[PDB]
Write a protein that binds this ligand. Structure first.
Ligand SMILES: Nc1ncnc2c1ncn2[C@@H]1O[C@H](CO)[C@@H](O)[C@H]1O
Ligand SMILES: Nc1ncnc2c1ncn2[C@@H]1O[C@H](CO)[C@@H](O)[C@H]1O
Ligand SMILES: O=C(NCO)c1ccccc1
Ligand SMILES: O=C(NCO)c1ccccc1
Ligand SMILES: O=C(NCO)c1ccccc1
Ligand SMILES: O=C(NCO)c1ccccc1
Ligand SMILES: O=C(NCO)c1ccccc1
Ligand SMILES: O=C(NCO)c1ccccc1
Ligand SMILES: O=C(NCO)c1ccccc1
Ligand SMILES: O=C(NCO)c1ccccc1
Ligand SMILES: [K+]
Ligand SMILES: [K+]
Lengths: 330, 330
């Protein structure tokens, strides 16, 4: 009897969300569908050009932890906010979802991270992230008892951008593995993979990471190829389990030579793709820690992702457990 | 040419929005469908019990001004935030909509007002508002040139709760009337009417207010009757024009002995009624300042209200001008 099914570790971020036209992205040199890092000056500039917005707690791993709790699993989260209103919002939303969260702010500056996310008519999301307080996350923030007591510890590739977060992750990998737990990561973003390609491959090949999440674009970026079949063959050789998502084409779960293909769920409309990969990881990891088959893990991932893309905001506002029951998955 | 069609004046608030069950309201002694004033201690208590939430700029008059701008009218706003992140969000959202907003914060404390709004399955909204920096709004915040150059100055009955806002409003009424403009108010909330019944009647009877907005519950509270026909007859005698909304039953515009009845729009589903009255006022006041008939003003009001109730959050995220064009209201 362990205390947590899934610990996640990521950049703690509040999202600021608006719709825009395609030309807005071009005019402002925003890379479509990507996570674009920005400084404080650029943050104020972009905000001045953004329309009326909505705020919602975000952060890739934060969303994943919230998803696992929503499904009925037991989640914990490490991430660093500031002692400010955005940080209070972030802390409230994750704890109110039933995620064990106790990372203490270090002060009011830098302020809590925020990401201006522009959603185009096709439902694609383009994020512009000022990391703020996330740069302070370090080994001091590792609750060792929580890592030791979690079936899986999952983290963002995005943590390679701030300076010291990787040290916390290496500590987590050591503690998790010494206690017989598993480590998992998401490749996060194809440009993130481009920045840290060798480091990410080393995480997998050295066995610090057991389960890897990627979408098509991230897998292609990892091996610097446009051949998807090649990318799947390569990723399967580099990690114990890979879960690769393909948007409207569903997902494929790889284990050695084993491949499990899962369909995307039928949807009403792609309102906003923000959170899709995060919630895929929620469903997958919930299923995994409940002892379900790899195929069923994929099915739970696709359900949760399919739900989140039909709403504005990155964390489902409806019950995923109720959805899973209805879909005959639980 | 004036500079503004509609100046609005109200409590500058950021909304914190969540769905709840019917029992939540009862367990927490929250008056359903009402605006419930709360202190800082109660705000922290209620927030601790609230689920994960979404934030969106609110304030009844703020919403109204944003609605006028969305329709293509020229709006201005007076309302006081703090120099904090919530205030920054408020300032951004209203200015980004093209509302002329210049009210400077006086410091960081008290913090910017927020309202915890609980939306039940029927789409009714129950608000719990900590006024914060709104208590500092006073005569010093009246931009006399803006009032002088606005065709209509509209304000909330809610302004009677903070201590000095009413003095600002009396100054506005003087300036507006000296420049041949009109004054309008909304009764805001039936308990608000109960607190300030005598004062509201005096505003109307003394001619400080020319156009009054009410819903059924506010009209009934004003005259302390459950006879709606009686309330209509009475309100028509007390103000030059009364616009009275009746939820799904539409609206009626009264001027002397004249009555103009308007149908509600038919709805797919009522998602969240937050902002309905505020956007009815946007549509009405946009029509009024464009020289439209009272019936057409009522039609523009009902269109805007019908749109806002079909989304989460109090300010339409779609184009009201586009909707009005499609409706042949133009
Ligand atoms: N640099 C980043 N690190 C972690 N998460 C991020 C980053 N930028 C944006 N996000 C989050 O990605 C989520 C969608 O996957 C959004 O909720 C947003 O908060
Ligand atoms: N005391 C108040 N004064 C002005 N507006 C309020 C108050 N309480 C809640 N609101 C606003 O009423 C709006 C809905 O009419 C919400 O957007 C909310 O911000
Ligand atoms: O946040 C950044 N780096 C990690 O600390 C950043 C900011 C602006 C531009 C590029 C990277
Ligand atoms: O005002 C807040 N915190 C103290 O500055 C606050 C505001 C909104 C949500 C949570 C906390
Ligand atoms: O190599 C990439 N894609 C596959 O051809 C790549 C490179 C830089 C940024 C994103 C993807
Ligand atoms: O690791 C490779 N690419 C990513 O940098 C690689 C190495 C040898 C052959 C093909 C791909
Ligand atoms: O804010 C209040 N009044 C106006 O300043 C208030 C707060 C809590 C309870 C009652 C009124
Ligand atoms: O960080 C902000 N302001 C300085 O404290 C901020 C955050 C969100 C929206 C606007 C401003
Ligand atoms: O008088 C009221 N309603 C009409 O019967 C009333 C009184 C207090 C609060 C709300 C409505
Ligand atoms: O003004 C009245 N009620 C609200 O206080 C009133 C006065 C006389 C007769 C009926 C209603
Ligand atoms: K979404
Ligand atoms: K609404």
């Amino acid at each position: 009897m362990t205390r947590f099914d899934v610990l996640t570790v990521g950049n703690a971020i509040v999202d600021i969300i608006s719709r825009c036209n395609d030309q807005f992205l071009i005019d402002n040199q925003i890379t479509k569908a990507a996570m674009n890092l920005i400084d404080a000056e650029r943050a104020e500039l972009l905000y001045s050009r953004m329309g009326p917005a909505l705020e919602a707690s975000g952060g890739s791993a934060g969303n994943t932890a919230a998803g696992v709790a929503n499904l009925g699993g037991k989640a914990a989260y490490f991430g660093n906010v500031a002692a400010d209103q955005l940080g209070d919002i972030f802390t409230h939303d994750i704890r109110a979802q039933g995620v064990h969260y106790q990372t203490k702010p270090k002060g009011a500056f830098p302020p809590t991270a925020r990401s201006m996310i522009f959603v185009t008519e096709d439902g694609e999301r383009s994020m512009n992230t000022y990391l703020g307080a996330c740069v302070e996350l370090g080994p001091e923030d590792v609750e060792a008892d929580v890592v030791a007591d979690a079936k899986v510890t999952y983290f963002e590739g995005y943590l390679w951008d701030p300076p010291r977060a990787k040290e916390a992750i290496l500590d987590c990998a050591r503690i998790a593995h010494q206690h017989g737990r598993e480590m998992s990561m998401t490749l996060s973003d194809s440009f993130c993979v481009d920045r840290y390609r060798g480091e990410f491959l080393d995480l997998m090949r050295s066995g610090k990471v057991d389960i890897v999440f990627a979408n098509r674009q991230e897998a292609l970026s990892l091996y610097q190829t446009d051949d998807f079949e090649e990318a799947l063959n390569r990723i399967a050789a580099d990690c114990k389990i890979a879960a690769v998502t393909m948007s409207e084409n569903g997902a494929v779960i790889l284990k050695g030579r084993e491949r499990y293909y899962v369909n995307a769920i039928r949807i009403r409309e792609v309102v906003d793709t923000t959170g899709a990969g995060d919630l895929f990881a929620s469903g997958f990891l919930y299923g995994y820690t409940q002892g379900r088959s790899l195929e069923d893990c994929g099915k739970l991932g696709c359900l949760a992702a399919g739900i989140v893309i039909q709403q504005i905001g990155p964390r489902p506002m409806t019950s995923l457990s109720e959805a899973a029951k209805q879909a005959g998955l639980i």
